Design a binder for this molecule. Structure first.
Ligand SMILES: [Cl-]
Ligand SMILES: [Cl-]
Ligand code: NA
Ligand code: NA
Length: 265
């Protein structure tokens, strides 16, 4: 059997729900190591060690913009750290360094007997997410650390759109009407540059640049897809292959693309 499989068999309803099967607690990081601030969300009853995901905001933004992912993912069996950057005005490369520093510190806390996450993390299984420049930073993290198991940035931007070196399974959430990082000049060229990975592009119909942030009105679909992608690729959990790889065939999705996701016999 798959040693990383956690939780009950998924359904559309169970993945669209506000909360997954596991009870979630959280704590503030006392002394951030290489980033500004962090909140760690974790399941108290996942029944085995789980992977870790680090999530970074966009320019000027704070944990609030990305917070909803913490409980949503942790409740399905992940340790999730949402960060504030050293400065709200840090650029993508710095955001990537800080994201990886947050993953490092989650690994440290996994080995710290006083930590609520002591022994809860499989430090070999990690993922990266983030908004806008924090999404660009997630793609930089993946490019520089190919042992990461999944990436799922939202409304990404970087000074370069060429992420051809990314071999990590990558889901790009995009926002159709984004006027900050227009899809046609940012998210879509980024998607098209990646040639060696499992990848997906999911654009929310009518979405502004904040369409995947806390308080969005598509938490059922966006949360289903983010959880399914992380389950499929961080846990190798093929119970999630359809949810991860499918076109939702949704009137809420103005553009859907995927490649190298479904397995061919
Ligand atoms: Cl930004
Ligand atoms: Cl916008
Ligand atoms: Na690259
Ligand atoms: Na539209």
């Amino acid at each position: 059997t798959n040693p990383y499989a956690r939780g009950p068999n998924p359904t559309a309803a169970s993945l669209e729900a506000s909360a997954g099967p596991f009870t979630v607690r959280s704590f503030t990081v006392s002394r951030p190591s290489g980033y500004g601030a962090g909140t760690v969300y974790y399941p108290t009853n996942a029944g085995g060690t789980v992977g870790a995901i680090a999530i970074v905001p966009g320019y000027t933004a704070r944990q609030s913009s990305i917070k909803w992912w913490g409980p949503r993912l942790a409740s399905h069996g992940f340790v999730v750290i949402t960060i504030d950057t050293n400065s709200t005005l840090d650029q993508p490369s710095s955001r990537s360094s800080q994201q990886m520093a947050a993953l490092r510190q989650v690994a440290s806390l996994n080995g710290t007997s006083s930590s609520p996450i002591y022994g809860k993390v499989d430090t070999a299984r990690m993922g990266v997410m983030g908004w806008s420049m924090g999404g660009g930073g997630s793609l930089i993290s993946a490019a520089n650390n190919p042992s990461l198991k999944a990436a799922a940035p939202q409304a990404p931007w970087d000074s370069s759109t060429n992420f051809s070196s990314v071999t990590v399974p990558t889901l790009i959430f995009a926002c159709e009407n984004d006027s900050i990082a227009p899809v046609n000049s940012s998210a879509l060229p980024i998607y098209d540059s990646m040639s060696r990975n499992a990848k997906q592009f999911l654009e929310i119909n009518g979405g502004s640049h904040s369409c995947a942030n806390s308080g969005n009105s598509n938490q059922a679909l966006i949360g289903k897809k983010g959880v399914a992608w992380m389950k499929r690729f961080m846990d190798n959990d093929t119970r999630y292959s359809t949810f991860a790889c499918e076109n939702p065939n949704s009137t809420r999705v103005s553009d859907f693309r995927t490649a190298n996701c479904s397995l061919e016999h």
